[PDB]
């Protein structure tokens, strides 16, 4: 299963491959934290 | 079943040298597409049918 550095490039296509929507992932008193969004 | 075996564990080793691909392999989606995508395109040249 040997695989050089190329691998990295796919993963900059998976990311490159992904409007943008977050999701709230948890909250309390007033404040909201949010995944996703990266280019906010 | 040996050779999945083995092909099982080379693939885990991989994923655990390699951090960055296993976090992007292993965040949760609803669209499983992409994870499909990338799998096979990294993986089919050195993996079984199975």
């Given at each position: 299963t040997i695989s050089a550095a190329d691998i990295e490039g796919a993963i900059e296509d998976y990311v490159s491959s992904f409007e943008e929507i977050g999701t709230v992932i948890d909250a309390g008193d007033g404040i909201a934290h949010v995944e996703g969004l990266p280019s906010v | 079943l040996t050779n999945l075996a083995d092909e099982l564990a080379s693939v885990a080793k991989l994923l655990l040298s390699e951090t960055a691909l296993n976090k992007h392999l292993a965040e949760?989606?609803?669209?499983s597409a992409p994870k499909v995508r990338l799998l096979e395109r990294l993986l089919s040249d050195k993996v079984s049918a199975t």
């Open positions: - | 949760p989606t609803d669209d």
